[PDB]
Structures are given as structure tokens and as C-alpha cells.
Design a protein around this nucleic acid. Structure first.
Ligand SMILES: *[C@@H]1O[C@H](CO)[C@@H](O[C@@H]2O[C@H](CO)[C@@H](O[C@@H]3O[C@H](CO[C@H]4O[C@H](CO)[C@@H](O)[C@H](O)[C@@H]4O)[C@@H](O)[C@H](O[C@H]4O[C@H](CO)[C@@H](O)[C@H](O)[C@@H]4O)[C@@H]3O)[C@H](O)[C@H]2NC(C)=O)[C@H](O)[C@H]1NC(C)=O
Ligand SMILES: *[C@@H]1O[C@H](CO)[C@@H](O[C@@H]2O[C@H](CO)[C@@H](O[C@@H]3O[C@H](CO[C@H]4O[C@H](CO)[C@@H](O)[C@H](O)[C@@H]4O)[C@@H](O)[C@H](O[C@H]4O[C@H](CO)[C@@H](O)[C@H](O)[C@@H]4O)[C@@H]3O)[C@H](O)[C@H]2NC(C)=O)[C@H](O)[C@H]1NC(C)=O
Ligand SMILES: *[C@@H]1O[C@H](CO)[C@@H](O[C@@H]2O[C@H](CO)[C@@H](O[C@@H]3O[C@H](CO)[C@@H](O)[C@H](O)[C@@H]3O)[C@H](O)[C@H]2NC(C)=O)[C@H](O)[C@H]1NC(C)=O
Ligand SMILES: *[C@@H]1O[C@H](CO)[C@@H](O[C@@H]2O[C@H](CO)[C@@H](O[C@@H]3O[C@H](CO)[C@@H](O)[C@H](O)[C@@H]3O)[C@H](O)[C@H]2NC(C)=O)[C@H](O)[C@H]1NC(C)=O
Ligand SMILES: *[C@@H]1O[C@H](CO)[C@@H](O[C@@H]2O[C@H](CO)[C@@H](O)[C@H](O)[C@H]2NC(C)=O)[C@H](O)[C@H]1NC(C)=O
Ligand SMILES: *[C@@H]1O[C@H](CO)[C@@H](O[C@@H]2O[C@H](CO)[C@@H](O)[C@H](O)[C@H]2NC(C)=O)[C@H](O)[C@H]1NC(C)=O
Ligand SMILES: *[C@@H]1O[C@H](CO)[C@@H](O[C@@H]2O[C@H](CO)[C@@H](O)[C@H](O)[C@H]2NC(C)=O)[C@H](O)[C@H]1NC(C)=O
Ligand SMILES: *[C@@H]1O[C@H](CO)[C@@H](O[C@@H]2O[C@H](CO)[C@@H](O)[C@H](O)[C@H]2NC(C)=O)[C@H](O)[C@H]1NC(C)=O
Lengths: 420, 420
DNA sequence: TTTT
DNA sequence: TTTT
């Protein structure tokens, strides 16, 4: 199409939980809370949020952690900007049960518009996407839910893109699809209107000027029912990034399960698994797997991970490595539910970066809604280099262990590690 | 079509190498040499042989083993039956180099017809199929090459079907395809003539009366270029047998490699691997893998086998097991080249039996020619029960070891076992 | 935070 | 015996 001549800039924002201190410095990454506060402070025209759930104050969790203050602060800002004239629009997946939405109620009193999307009725999944669209110029995409633990107790990774109206407007197209599909008694059209169609897919990515240097970027979305003709499926983009790699593949995802799970009877989904095996066997790609282990991690994952870790022989010139990133939790932090975990989901190769909002399982790519950003930048350095440095800092941390590590030495409770 | 009302009978013939003594008795299986001698003695009209290579006397190997006597005896019989009026027709793959064909020369002097098939020119593989067709009534199909070591030094498994003109004639259709395609300067027709077409495929298998009880049988052939419209591909039949299983899958194959190997650069072929994983994960199928390890076994296989053996967790209700069957070899037998190995290739489920002539790798199903027999018999007992008993005798033998076994304790030289 |  |  036509190039976006916008001073597009990108920042990698990650929230580091308390008690997690990477000795290596130079991280120099703004926290998700700081980036969100900066976005809200500069918001004056519009704001579109797509969230899995909202749990910000201490009341929504019935806890008494001072650590929630930052999250509460965000809520305050969200309440202040509605009366100023900003069109706040929030899409939140419908809770299966009658869960009280205190934060949503407060926002509705403020003047925001909340349209709850009942994904189970239409596609049989949930709306687990996390992205922001501010003034149709800036946007945030990452692994952060509107929770206060995702700002202080969960580890994270997201990108805030500034001064990129074209890409932000492309992300809005998706938010508007969610907005229309979840008002009341609606269903997926056979053909989406020309409003929701896009011209920036994997075949023809958009030419942005990222930090001065030219780059090719595009957004991919799940599930296939909600994707217009132009939009590239998230699984297709992920597999293309995996296939195009020639030197290394670094992946940091929270859950990796080659199955369409929570879908009894058990169903096998070897889409991503085969791609990694092909990459590590047909080509001399060094593949590094960084999974996160917490109390709610399905144990059946471990076996599959071992199946991947066995492909490491000189004869096969294969270099698959798997490591588990476990965030330690002391007695006080163990009381917080769904608190201490690494929820980053991204993949960096030697020539491309993938930042997504959904874990790697069949549900997130067939039923559950998700969005991802793919950026290829020619030349050394850039966004890819920063993401690679982040991954290498995580990989060499004392918080990442091999699959044979005894579960006692790990700080938290790991279901993927065998005792002694 | 129309049922074959022939007193079809089936015998499982296996050659047990010297030094291999299964303490458990009741094997009661005629040796391949005895079955071949019986077939040749009763041959009076025709005889069609498809063989990878011919090496029967001691001269063809430049050795002095008395163990070759049986093989030599077979050669003598093969020379005697040509003058009697039997139309001997032999298809043998063209040796890459100018290897002397002493046995083929002797047979040509006897009066036989030898048409050497240059598979490399047409399909870029070899003619590694092993089957016999006697009087168009009896036939033999199995893992035995026209070698004297395949009768005394290599372990084997084949089926001799007696009084089954319809099935024998169906096997001839394949032999005639090989005969026509390898005379001189020929190529694969775009559409094979109606002579080579068959009506007994996986969709409509042939109804035979095996040992009195009704059964459904059909033959599958590789590679796809040589297969007529009716003929079912060998890979398709194998995958259908794997998919249809509900209780267990027992496989005894000489080489298992999920790759189109000897095809640099390395290519990934996860066709059978995914089928086994789906069977063991989606369904509660107990899968048992019995691979054979010898000096010429590619080491890169080991890693892949380990990748399969990792799928064994209660949570995954998966029961993949892998074992290596190694035939011991003393000092005297170590001198014989390509001698001490288990070359059986078959798979038995709770409702079907597969007996094939090719190992499990990409070449044998994409390029290399191969043939297999599939028999489903309703009710307990029968051919399936005997094959299952054979597999269970092999599995519990002292000659089958787990993949973690030290390579020193094994009698032979194993490239798939790590020292200490 | 998608898993009890 | 398909693998050097
Ligand atoms: C493309 O262009 C964008 C736009 O500028 C760049 O984004 C900037 O990136 C730099 C480097 O990542 C950011 O600078 C860093 O900010 C971190 C967080 O900012 C806050 O830091 C403290 C936290 O208490 C606050 O007091 C402060 O006011 C900020 O709000 C800092 O922590 C970093 O300092 C740390 O790291 C450096 C080494 O990097 C050390 O020397 C320091 O001592 C300290 O340890 C650093 O200042 C900058 O904030 C980003 N801009 C914006 C607007 O956020 C992209 O980086 C650029 N991309 C590429 C590839 O060049
Ligand atoms: C469908 O119908 C066919 C046609 O009959 C059956 O094929 C017969 O199968 C039986 C059982 O497998 C065969 O009988 C066995 O033969 C073995 C080999 O035969 C030779 O044995 C010695 C070897 O030196 C020779 O002297 C002899 O003359 C034969 O040439 C024997 O070794 C077996 O005996 C051993 O096992 C039994 C237990 O089974 C012990 O009791 C014995 O002591 C001994 O250890 C046995 O005699 C028979 O030969 C097959 N027929 C033909 C023509 O070959 C199929 O079995 C049948 N299928 C089903 C499912 O019923
Ligand atoms: C996205 O674009 C906007 C507008 O182009 C950028 O805002 C600009 O940011 C620069 C750097 O902070 C500002 O320069 C500063 O100006 C003040 C005087 O106002 C001066 O005292 C400082 O020393 C500095 O030179 C600039 O004024 C400001 N422009 C506007 C209109 O606000 C913004 O920085 C861009 N996004 C990112 C992430 O950089
Ligand atoms: C395939 O079919 C042929 C022909 O139907 C079978 O040959 C038959 O085998 C039986 C059993 O050995 C023979 O019976 C025997 O007859 C002799 C007299 O000739 C008798 O002394 C024995 O006690 C026994 O009853 C039968 O004669 C023979 N028929 C022919 C025409 O040869 C053959 O056995 C079948 N294949 C298999 C594997 O059984
Ligand atoms: C969250 O905290 C408690 C519930 O645990 C509640 O606090 C109330 O706060 C308001 C405003 O200050 C008071 O008028 C009420 O008396 C408080 N109730 C108590 C102390 O039981 C309330 O649900 C939440 N508080 C805030 C400030 O949002
Ligand atoms: C070939 O594989 C062997 C494993 O037997 C590698 O040997 C050692 O591998 C460990 C980790 O796998 C390293 O820490 C050692 O430094 C290796 N030792 C030596 C002498 O190399 C070997 O590195 C592999 N060859 C490669 C990767 O080129
Ligand atoms: C195989 O064995 C040897 C080669 O190692 C050869 O034996 C010859 O046998 C014929 C027939 O008995 C004799 O006339 C020759 O004199 C033998 N040659 C020798 C002993 O050097 C021959 O190549 C093969 N023998 C047979 C019987 O096939
Ligand atoms: C569940 O898995 C465990 C492995 O931790 C099995 O426990 C033992 O498994 C070994 C072989 O894997 C057997 O030899 C032992 O007899 C098992 N012990 C017990 C007490 O069962 C266990 O069998 C598995 N459960 C199944 C297969 O139902």
C-alpha cells in the first residue's frame, strides 16, 4: 500500500515482580505501570482497551497487599479521564459465573462504555487478548491483564508503540470487530464488511519507519472465525516466523502444550511442535525453549517438553534446549492467588520478532481470541536486539532451571519438576 | 467384488539365526528355508520372484561358512525347476556398481528370465521388495532377501499363504508391473493399463476364507509413481491400521527413522511418528516399539526413539514403550558381513495385522518400492493371535533391552546405546 | 491467569 | 541389508 511516514517508535516495557532482581543491569526498560500511566496522562481523544478480566483494587481479590497500590492508581486515572471527554471503550470477556465487576461498575459510573463479549456462545472460547489504543496514535500490546498482580507480582513483556497512527488504527480495526461482535445477540457475519478488512498481512506487511530505520510490521489475530480476508492468522504468522529462521529461535512462553486441551477427549495438535522440529533438524537452527512453571501449570506438559529435549544429538545436528523459568515466592506472596509467574509470550529469531498475547496451545489458536505483532527490521540492532537481550538475561538467570532439576531447590511450587 | 472361495491358509514362517534360542517353546513355525523348499518342490507351472539382491553361495560373499549350505541348496533347487518347464521370472534391482551376479548368471544358464530393474533412473530409489508367487496359487511375502544369511544369520518374519489364487494373482499384478517397467528404456505411464488395475483396496478389501473363518485381506504397494488407481499406498494402509487401533499397537521393525534420510540436506518426515503419538495420546492405546540395533544402524535414530519414549505419563495416559532387539554375535559370526540382525517388519493391533517388506523411513514410502499385506479377521485367535504371540516372545526375550542399557552388556555392537 |  |  502506502508507507506510514510516522515517527514510529517502540519501547519494550516489562513488569518485574518484587523479589526478582536480575544482577545484570542495563535493562533500562520502563515498567508496564509507568507506560500505562504515561499513556493515560497523554490521552485526550480516545482510548480502546481489550482485556481478559479486570481486577485492580484489593477488594476484587479480598486481600490486603499494599503491592496493589499501583494498580489502584491506574484505576483512579481511568476514572479521571472519562469525564474529560475521552471516549473510553472497554471489551471484557463475559465471566462464566456471576463474578462481580466492581471496577467495571466504577468505570460505568465514570462514563466509560463496557461491552462484555460472550465468546463461549459464538466460538466456544474466551477473549484473552490484551491491547490498548490511545488517541489512535499510540498503542500497547503484551501479556498484561487489567490486574494489579500483572503490575507487581506477575513477570511480563509488552511493547508500547508511540507515534504510529497507521499501526494503531490497524489494531483498532480488531478492537472494533470485538466491539461489534459482542454488543447483544450478534453472530459472526459470513463476510465481514469492508470496514474491518485490512491490507497489511504477512504477504504485504506495512512499511513503517521504526526509530528512524525502515521496518516491516504487521498484526495477526485469532480465532479464524473473527479474521477478515486481509488479516493473517496468528498461527500462520508464528509458523512463518519459525520457518524463516536460519540461525536461532528463542521462545519465551508461559504455557506450551501441543494439544487442543481442556477439550476432552484428548486431542493432538502438533502444529508448532513439528515447526520447531523441522527448524532444528532440517536446518542448523539453535532453538531455545523458555517455559514458566507455577502451581496452575498442567503436569501433562512436562512429558511433551521432554519429547522436545531429546532431539539434541551431534549426528542430528539438533540443538533443542528447554528451560523452566520459575519466579520464587516467599510465605507472604504465596497467599496471593494467581500471583507469582512469568507470563511473557514472545519469540525472537535472528531476523524477526514476535510479540503475542496468547500461550502456545490449540485453544489459543483455534478458539480463544488473540493478537500478535510481527516486526522485521533490516540491519543490526533495533527492537529485535533489545528483545534478544531480554531473553538472554532471562535464560542465564538463576530463575531458569533444566527439566531435571529437583522441585525442592526451586523457590516456588513447580508441577513440572520431579521431587529428588 | 466377488468372494474368493479358496481354501486359503496362512503360515507364519520365520528364520531363527544360530545362537538365538527362545526358551519359551510352542513357536512351531516352519523356517523360511523349509517353506521355500516346499514351494519350489511343488512348483510345476510358474514362479515369480521379486528380490532386492541375490547372494546365496559362499563365493558371492568370499567367505567359508558352512552355514551357507541351506542357501546353496535353495539355489540348486532353483536351477532344477527351470528345465522342467516352469516359467521362472526374476526381478532384481540394478546394483549401482558392476557387482558380479553369479547366481543370476547360473539361473540364466538354467533357463530363467532375469529382468534387472534400474529404479534409480525412474523413481530415484531401489527395488527393495521381497515376495514370491508360485503357480499363481501360493505366495510368500516377508523380510527375506535371496541371501543365505537371511536364512541362517538374519532373524526374519514372513507369511506363506497357500491355496489363495485370487490374492496370489493380485500380488502378480504388482510383479508384472515391475516386470514391464524394468525391461529396457521404459518409464512410468501416465495411466497404467487396465491389466495392472486392482479392485481390492483398503476401501473394499477382498473377502477370503482364511483357515475356515472369513477374513478381509488386501495388498498395498510403494512407491506412489508405480501404484495404479485401485492399489492402496503402503503408507496409507499403515496409517489406517495405526488409526483404527483401540487397545494396543505392537510394531517390530528393523529401522525407524522419521526422516526422508540419505537425502541431504536433512528432511523431516513425521507421518508415522504423529500417527503413533495420536494413537497413544488421543486414545488409550498401548504402543510397543521393537527396533533392531546392529553395526550399520544410523546413530541419529536413537534421539528420535527417545523423543517417542518421553510420552509416558499417567496424566497423559500415554504408554509408549521402546525396546531394541539385538541378536548376539560371537567372534566367528562377527566376521560375516551384514549377518547378525533382526530384520522383521510387521505391526499387529487388537483387530488387524500388517506384514511388510520395507523399514519405516521416508525413502521406503516415497521412493523405494515395497509391498505389504493387511489382514483383518473377526473373532479371537487366527493369524493375528500367532503374530501377537511371536511379538510377545520377542519382546520378553533376553535379546531386547531398554534404550538406557549400556552398550557393553549387549552381545553385538550397538550404535544406539551409550557406553557405561 | 485461562484452569479448577 | 539398503548404507557406506
Ligand atoms: C526507540 O526510541 C524509543 C523512544 O526514545 C526508545 O525508548 C527509550 O528507551 C530507553 C532505553 O530503553 C529508555 O531509557 C531508559 O528508561 C528506563 C525507564 O525509564 C524510567 O526510569 C526511571 C525509573 O525509576 C525514572 O526515574 C525515569 O524518569 C523513567 O521514567 C530507565 O530505567 C533507564 O535507565 C536505566 O538503564 C540505563 C541503561 O539503559 C542506565 O544507564 C541507567 O543508570 C538506569 O539503570 C533508561 O533511562 C527511554 O525511557 C525510552 N523512551 C521512553 C519515552 O520511554 C527505544 O529504546 C528506541 N529503540 C532502540 C532500539 O533504540
Ligand atoms: C492355518 O492352517 C495352516 C495349514 O495347516 C497352519 O499351518 C500349520 O501351522 C502349524 C502350527 O504352526 C505347523 O505345525 C508346526 O510345524 C513346525 C515346523 O514344521 C516342521 O517341523 C519339524 C522341524 O524339524 C519338521 O520335522 C516337520 O516335518 C515340519 O516340516 C513344527 O516345528 C511344530 O512343532 C513344534 O511346535 C509344536 C507346538 O506348536 C510342539 O508341540 C512340537 O513338539 C514342536 O515343538 C508344528 O508341528 C504346520 O506345519 C503348518 N502347516 C504347514 C503346511 O506348514 C496354520 O497354523 C493355521 N493357522 C491357524 C491360526 O490355525
Ligand atoms: C511522539 O511525538 C510527540 C510529538 O512529536 C513527541 O513529543 C515531543 O517530545 C520531545 C522530547 O521530549 C519534546 O521536546 C522537548 O521540548 C521541550 C519544550 O516543550 C524542551 O524543553 C525539551 O528540552 C525537549 O526538547 C517535544 O516538545 C514534544 N512535542 C510535543 C508536541 O509534545 C513524543 O516524544 C513522541 N513519542 C516519544 C515516545 O518520543
Ligand atoms: C492346498 O491344497 C492342496 C490340495 O487341496 C492340499 O493338498 C492336500 O493335502 C492333504 C493333507 O496333506 C492331503 O491329504 C493326504 O492324502 C494322502 C493320500 O494322498 C493321505 O495318505 C494322507 O493321510 C492325507 O489324508 C491331500 O492328498 C492333498 N491333496 C493334493 C491334491 O495334493 C494342501 O495341503 C493345501 N495346502 C496346505 C498348506 O495344506
Ligand atoms: C475496599 O476496601 C473495603 C472492603 O474491604 C471497603 O472500604 C470502604 O471504603 C469506603 C470509602 O472510604 C468507606 O466509606 C467504607 O466504610 C469502607 N468499608 C469498610 C471499611 O468496611 C470498600 O469496599 C473498598 N474501599 C474503597 C476505598 O474502595
Ligand atoms: C557433541 O556432543 C557431545 C556430547 O557427548 C558434546 O560434548 C560435550 O557436550 C557438553 C554439553 O552437551 C559440553 O558442556 C562439553 O563442553 C562438550 N565437550 C566437548 C569435548 O565438546 C560436544 O560438544 C558436541 N559437539 C558439538 C556441539 O559440536
Ligand atoms: C565357489 O568356490 C570356489 C571359489 O572359492 C570355486 O570352486 C571351484 O569349483 C569347481 C567345481 O567343483 C572346480 O572345478 C574348481 O576347480 C573350483 N575352484 C577352486 C577350488 O579354486 C568356485 O568358484 C565355486 N565352487 C562351486 C562348486 O560353485
Ligand atoms: C503412574 O505412574 C507411576 C510412575 O511414577 C507408576 O508407578 C510405578 O511405575 C512402575 C513403572 O513405571 C511400575 O513398575 C510400578 O509397579 C508402579 N508402582 C505403582 C505403585 O503403581 C504407576 O504404575 C502409574 N499408574 C498406572 C500405570 O496406572
Amino acid at each position: 500500500p502506502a508507507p506510514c511516514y510516522d515517527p514510529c517508535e517502540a519501547v519494550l516495557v516489562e513488569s518485574i515482580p518484587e523479589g526478582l532482581d536480575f544482577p545484570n543491569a542495563s535493562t533500562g526498560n520502563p515498567s508496564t505501570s509507568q507506560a500505562w500511566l504515561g499513556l493515560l496522562a497523554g490521552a485526550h481523544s480516545s482510548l480502546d482497551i481489550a482485556s481478559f478480566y479486570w481486577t485492580l483494587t484489593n477488594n476484587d481479590t479480598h486481600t490486603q497487599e499494599p503491592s496493589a497500590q499501583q494498580g489502584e492508581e491506574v484505576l483512579r486515572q481511568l476514572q479521571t479521564l472519562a469525564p474529560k471527554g475521552v471516549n473510553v471503550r472497554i471489551a471484557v470477556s463475559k465471566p462464566s459465573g456471576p463474578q462481580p465487576q466492581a471496577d467495571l461498575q466504577a468505570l460505568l459510573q465514570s462514563g466509560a462504555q463496557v461491552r462484555m463479549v460472550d465468546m463461549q456462545k459464538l466460538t466456544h472460547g474466551v477473549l484473552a487478548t490484551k491491547f490498548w489504543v490511545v488517541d489512535q496514535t499510540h498503542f500497547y500490546l503484551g501479556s498484561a491483564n487489567m490486574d494489579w498482580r500483572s503490575l507487581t507480582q506477575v513477570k511480563e513483556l509488552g511493547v508500547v508503540m508511540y507515534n504510529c497512527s497507521c499501526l494503531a488504527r490497524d489494531l483498532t480495526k480488531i478492537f472494533e470487530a470485538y466491539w461489534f461482535l459482542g454488543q447483544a445477540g450478534s453472530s459472526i457475519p459470513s463476510t465481514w464488511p469492508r470496514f474491518y478488512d485490512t491490507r497489511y498481512n504477512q504477504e504485504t506487511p506495512m512499511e513503517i519507519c521504526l526509530n528512524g530505520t525502515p521496518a516491516l510490521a504487521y498484526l495477526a489475530s485469532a480465532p479464524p472465525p473473527l479474521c477478515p480476508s486481509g488479516r493473517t492468522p496468528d498461527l500462520k504468522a508464528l509458523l512463518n516466523v519459525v520457518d524463516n529462521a536460519r540461525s536461532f529461535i528463542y521462545v519465551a512462553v508461559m504455557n506450551y502444550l501441543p494439544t487442543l486441551e481442556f477439550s476432552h477427549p484428548h486431542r493432538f495438535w502438533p502444529a508448532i511442535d513439528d515447526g520447531l522440529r523441522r527448524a532444528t533438524y532440517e536446518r542448523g537452527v539453535k532453538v531455545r525453549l523458555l517455559i514458566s512453571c507455577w502451581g496452575h501449570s498442567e503436569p501433562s506438559m512436562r512429558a511433551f517438553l521432554l519429547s522436545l529435549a531429546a532431539l539434541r544429538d551431534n549426528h542430528t545436528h539438533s540443538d533443542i534446549q528447554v528451560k523452566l523459568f520459575v519466579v520464587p515466592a516467599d510465605e507472604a506472596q504465596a497467599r496471593i492467588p494467581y500471583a507469582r509467574v512469568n507470563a511473557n509470550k514472545y519469540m525472537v529469531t535472528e531476523r524477526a520478532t514476535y510479540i503475542g498475547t496468547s500461550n502456545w496451545s490449540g485453544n489459543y489458536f483455534t478458539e480463544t481470541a488473540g493478537t500478535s505483532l510481527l516486526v522485521t527490521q533490516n540491519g543490526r540492532g533495533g527492537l529485535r536486539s533489545q528483545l534478544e537481550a531480554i531473553f538472554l538475561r532471562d535464560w542465564d538467570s538463576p530463575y531458569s532451571h533444566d527439566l531435571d532439576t529437583s522441585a525442592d531447590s526451586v523457590g516456588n511450587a513447580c508441577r513440572l519438576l520431579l521431587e529428588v
